[model samples]
Target: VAHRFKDLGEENFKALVLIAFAQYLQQCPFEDHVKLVNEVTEFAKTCVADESAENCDLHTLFGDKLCTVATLRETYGEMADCCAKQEPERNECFLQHKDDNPNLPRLVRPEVDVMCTAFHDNEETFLKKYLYEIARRHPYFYAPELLFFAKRYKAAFTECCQAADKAACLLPKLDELRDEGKASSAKQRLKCASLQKFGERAFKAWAVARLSQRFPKAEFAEVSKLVTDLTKVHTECCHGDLLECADDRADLAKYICENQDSISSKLKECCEKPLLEKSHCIAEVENDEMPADLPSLAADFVESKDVCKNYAEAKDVFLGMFLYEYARRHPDYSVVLLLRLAKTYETTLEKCCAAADPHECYFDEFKPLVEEPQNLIKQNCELFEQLGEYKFQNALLVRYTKKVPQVSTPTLVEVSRNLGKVGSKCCKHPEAKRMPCAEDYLSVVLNQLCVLHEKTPVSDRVTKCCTESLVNRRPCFSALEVDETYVPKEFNAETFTFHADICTLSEKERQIKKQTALVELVKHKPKATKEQLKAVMDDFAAFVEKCETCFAEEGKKLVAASQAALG
Candidate 1:
């Protein structure tokens, strides 16, 4: 077995030895098994600097020696002499006892076949195939830490080994798979031995092991929690299919995205490291066309070469580019209206793309509504209502603001006419009071916009009023006046205290105050030593911390009341 492992990689060979040894120990006598295992372990440690298998000579350690057998026969000489006289009886006795020996683990199926292939001169050709198959049987044998990831993913290492060209089955490089296109089905993807997917699978395995070792004290559950907390990090750092990276980083990314929500507070310190350090472990799998691969919805308009103008909203990138080119040709159109045309696409894009497959499915489904901007605006913009109240209100105002400053006279006339039709629907929105305010606000802004544009035209007005800093066009669509400064008028109260304020004592000071307060109370009765007081304070610090916030608030009210009385 030692000679057989001479060519195997250290990791592959060690795992085989461990798994085999673990099975071997099961049949050994408990007392001798432990003693010999310890001896071998110590010897193995010594062999670390020496690759010579002489230190790990298992037969020398575990086998029954002929010398010991000879000594045993000499002690039973009378019986041995009797056995020699009765040779047939002696043979029968030996054969009868043979079945009494303990059973050992047996090699089965592919393992036996793989072992036979090792003798071939082309060992390298068969070794990887053999071990890769062996790895399938010994699931927990190699990289035991990834057993959790293994279970979760149910990765069949067997698939790659069983492939017609087994070595090539490992995941292909990203560039290799770039032109490969889609799989026949999700099932085909799961079984795919292509190098990219195999790499992804391997990457996942290695990364999970790395993370487990990285946070040695952390629970499996806590890793998942970190992912949840760092959602915003993904939103910013990653784009479509974050796990598509070139190497181990891709695997690491999959691990972070999948199981980062581990609720362990110990992980908080781990997460505080530089974003690049933490995220680079599994960076975004980028493509050359990465910049153009915008969010699901945004990708649709710009990805295709044709100018998707009618479907595009004001904020749409495609619309923005289209309007920019349009501005080059038709310089007289208000720069504001041209910009608003750019924004129009973004608004519809957001609404339409909120569901699955925005580019392919949702956009096509909503193409009719998208192509007619005036009709989309006049149709009471019922889609915004589906975005929930807060989002609906905010998105509505945002869309109007982008469009209002840039609208042409004709656009403003159409917008005001549409506003007149939808004004009642806006006022009667689900949130009764909030709806009316938004409705009245939009009503007033649009009427003023139409009237202003009718006299001097929007291009001239945009050059004048819109030339300064961008207005708080949202307030123009809300039931509030935009002034030099605006402050919130409403505030909510908590507990008995309407307005919460600072407590005189700091957190540390408050704990000391508690200790002091207790010490002084005892002082009235009997004197205490400084050391004794210090010990008592130290002893209860943790208990005090638990209730510190609660008592701290009470202390604040008392201090305020005392100050008022003193005045």
Candidate 2:
């Protein structure tokens, strides 16, 4: 099985491993199922290394494996995964910041973030794909950690150019799908095909992916034509010449333009509008001498090329005209305005691309509104700092505002409450236009805490009260006890199974990776130390030992709150 497993593509192996594991739990004995889960989990952690896959793996570690398998039988937990609602609010909070400062925070996609629960649900699939991706190219990835970046070279254009988003854009999901036993749809295959067609598909895919908001229909046609043209050239070249020089390709391009006159015209015309006009658009009919296979929209496309004064003007026209069309077809409301703004982006991008000072062009006129998401949130954090204090106490109102959005999960109050530290951090760099690091991540956490927990009670308010006391040097709560989970086990010579020569730990799995590694699961412990395996008769205890505890009381309270709210 191990030998044959190596030859399999990532998709096949994962489905066989994970979906089968999902099946096996239905028939297998509890002990058998657990053993199976353990092997897969270890393989997933060892083989896969997505930064986001941690919580799901951790949930699996803590969950009843068989029960989770039952959950899978319920169609991948979609009904139970409404928690994605939590994410958009964060984006909104960040957006509020953007509205105020327009310079600090980056743009985020509203759809990218799945609920932690849904992510947890999908982990088995995620792990399997990650594992096989490693195995297929096993030799190239002999350096352990290096292999997890299996096809990052392929991932570069998208990853490098796009800003952070909350929405799971088309590409990554496609990557995930292709990862889990669907190689044809996988990122590599798609990229290969797209590029092979002289980047027509690639260009179209990029245009559609980024600007589907502006010229939804036109982008589709434009990009599609580019692909068809490229494919035709491929066929022609195949029977004849593959182009020995740049001049050879010019003929093919011209032929494509002749065939797609309407499209080419619209494309050129759209590419020629002023920024504000493109952004706050006004439609105009156009005529150009594009060829027969050209789309209807190409009339304007041709016009944009003729009317525009400069590249920036053309770009605004190009992006704006198409993007507005896309916005009309968008699936979600959140990105509608953003899609409209996309044309403005292309207009600015044209300027930036041809500019003497590209960075200035980029920062000043062209970068997408989403790029400065931190700036978006920072301004809001300041406003809230003032607002929360006006509504509450002054000493920590600033802290409370920053904490409101900081909580990723529902003590989130405590986590959000800590955002005040960013306010202090900001004081150090008072005159700077951009938010400092202290203001970005940690402050978002603080600001959220203030918002979400405005009237809420936490499971450990006493400890929080006491912790606050410690932070402010006040009294400890009478009910508070040591919040004991574990400190690191003593690295005693006696507990060591490892010696310098005998240790088989790989170079990448050296002390640091070893120490921090399994954090994908919510809990980590030195598994080597607690070898009193025989003493625990039941498997439940073994499960409990691995469970990373989120405050049990708080978690229960959340369920109750949710139930009450729903009821």
Candidate 3:
């Protein structure tokens, strides 16, 4: 208990002691629970009255004055689920239940005079007592009290609010305080003390944002002390340059990256300089560089907008702005891949903003965590890969290849043969950060197919001539070339009719099918030179004559496979 009290805040220390004693009381027989409470109160009375140890009464500072009639255990049990949440839901349900039920004790608001009268006409004492009570209630009490205190007491509330405002009121005002904390001052006591509080809270907010991941066990206690040391280091080191470069946030980040060396030596004397420490400190510094982090964003949005209404609608607007800008700025990235990535937000919407309409529910959920958007992005990025694989290979092929001449229907058919592999290569990047490469390699290459095939135009007449010839089919020549060379034995229309019957195709159909197949073979084997491609097509022409049934079945198979794969 003494060790816990040594290095923690006054509120945290008091809470710990109460928790410890509460557990101890629960474990002991009922006889000792009240006895131990009395002994602890006696000890507290001595501590609060002491001339030395001004902070000794910290443990008794929170919660209500000791109730004589109600058992502390029963009171805690009543409010256990009530205040379990930060802005607890049960506070509403039970408060209504109490208002509805006549059996419950009256919690009526005290008259102004009566409230002021409670502290012997000491307005300051009453204000402190009232504010502490409001603050101790779940944070739900906080918003109402801000106005309640002001309206009820007028100038009294304003004066008290101003005093507390020096600590933190509006986030903008808190930001100003943070900037002040960065400055070195002649009044070392107050200047550094304010900086210390700023350090603790800012670090607390920043660290809490990143708590989606687990940390090393040693890091469990390391953040608070590191925050303390960071406060001291800021006073000693000049981060004035970081604030000045705020016009460009990236510049602010870069400056912090370079200037850590300036303060690390001073800070390392008191705080451990482990890599994790450096990593955490770096993130908070980026947040400090910004005009607002997640917490401030949350507070401001909630103040203005209440809860969000259509999560998908709002997300669409936000994502469109962010993603289009990102893609436009990074044009080197694949557009198809980024477009595909843009759809994964539906999964996140279902998980996080499961609203009647996501846009409204989105704000209700995320407005509270607005300051930590980068952390939220990190949390959701991995989910991008978990979005189902890219399965529409043929449709995507047609879409990508529409204008490129080399992407004939045959090429689409050939590539669709390996659609599974295409899907894997297109969307299965190891990390979500690498998702921009999600289009199949062949799909992207088609954009330049017109240029690649500009010199290799295969003529329709030459293909027909190749099909008609038989003896010279292996090195099949066009009509113009055949005039200077040789003719085939089955070059006549009778032989053509014979070939078509075995192939179950018309003579014209047979020629066209073979031509398309030849083109597909060349496209699939890009490593084959133009001469090699022509030679292979010539070999195919000869093979058609040697066994027409073989050519007939292969052509039917490709047609069937292509039709199915295209869809």
Candidate 4:
């Protein structure tokens, strides 16, 4: 095996050695498995650094005394035919024969009692056998989720073995574990299908959105690099290079653990987990809280004039870095909002770079584009603080309903309620932190709304937005104009009635009740001018103020005032 790969580079040589070892280990008895594995792994490390194949202890690693055609035939089964070939052809034959051997015996899961005995006897050997058996049986099917499953299997056995009734404790868990494994396999299949169908660019976009949501506090630049690397891993693993996939994934886990502090302190505990457990642990870790001292805005965005140059060099990377800087500094903004900002900046650069004077167009045009979203954030945050959750959501409900009246009332209600929940959760933070929290949460709700509207027929603007790329969808939604063709139902005074009991409510409840009535007023009178609506609201406010002094006969009087204002 070693002589056949002598002319190969270190990487290719190690790859072949790994393939050979896995194939050999598939038939090797459980007792010799760990020892052989350890020896091959150690030899791989030592051989890579040494130049000559002759000095690299390959004979000892492969057992020179025991190595023969018969031993090769016993180990590799059908693939042992490759051993008859010569030199480079032998290497090529081995490469082509690296897949599963048809004649290898099928692996069966041991009985619970027997498995427990083996596990109790030597936990290390049992686990190696378990992992190797799975790898051998399904040589072409590989996923990180399998490693995760193995971790869970080990954990389950470790827990159940200590129980007084071990079989009883472990038996029920078997079906659950089987189901989980099936789910994982199904997910991996879907991912591979998606990669095949959507291509890498779309997959990477989906990956970035996913990872950014997972590690919301991690810098976007770091997340982008991770997504790129993981995309490569998925591309290979999905295509069935299990050993290389495993090696690359291990390296990725190591990279994350080594840089835990810069990436996220939340990953510290995950970093300490066993190598195979690290990926699962990291996946389960919660999103980091926005840092209290994060700068309000990136200085680079304001001070740098090299936008066109940087964007010209590498459009995706330059914009991604811009997104990272902006997102980290403004953690309250949703990923959708941040993506929108990046897209907007990219669009600005594209246009400005083509202008008579690039820097002037960028400076003149981009400042307000940047400030527009900031202003919207400011306005929403102000409304949230002033109106509180109930009234704030009512405001959102009214605004969106008016903007997209073609949408069903139930859908609008759901969208507004979800957006309100975001405000309620995020608006409680201190002034400096409030905006980022609110904005970030807001993006999640909007993305969900996008999904809800994806297949439903609605306005052209909404359909356009819902159909946009994940990166651009939120921005598209944000830019939507009110439906010009939507005509409101006739205004009804009965719907705007304020009861006399309104005076008995607390100040906040009174405000919320009044806001609800105003929303109803807007909903029924969608064509009513802003000036007319303001006049009606002003009159209602005055009536409520006076009614606090004297609570008698206010409901009918309030209705009269609303009727007059509407006319």
Per-prediction TM-score, please? Answer: 0.17, 0.22, 0.20, 0.47
In candidate 4, stretches whose alpha carbon ends up further than 4 angstroms from where it belongs are 1-224, 230-255, 261-266, 273-313, 321-338, 348-366, 430-436, 468-484, 490-521, 528-567
Computed on alpha carbons, the lDDT of every model, listed in order, comes to 0.32, 0.32, 0.32, 0.60
Better model by TM-score: candidate 1 vs candidate 3: 3
lDDT of 4 at 255: 84
Candidate 3, residues 433-532: lDDT per residue as tens digits?
Answer: 2223322232323212212233443433333423331211111221122111211122122212223443566443454455444334433333334455
* Cα distance off (Å), candidate 2, residue 502: 35
Candidate 3: residue 246 lDDT (0-100)? 21
Model 1 lDDT, full chain set: 0.32
Best by lDDT: 4
Deviation from truth (RMSD, Å), model 2: 24.1
Cα lDDT of model 1 by residue, 319-353, tens digit: 43343333332222223223333344445455655
lDDT of 4 by residue, 429-459 (tens): 6555554555445545554465456566767
Summarize candidate 2's per-residue lDDT along 317-436 as a digit string, tens digits: 345344434333331212312332454555555566667654444413323443443443356456545545121122232222222212222242233233333343343443332232
Give the range of the ten consecutive residues with the poorest summed lDDT in model 1. 178-187
RMSD of each: 29.5, 24.1, 31.2, 15.9
In model 4, the Cα lDDT at residue 303 comes to 42
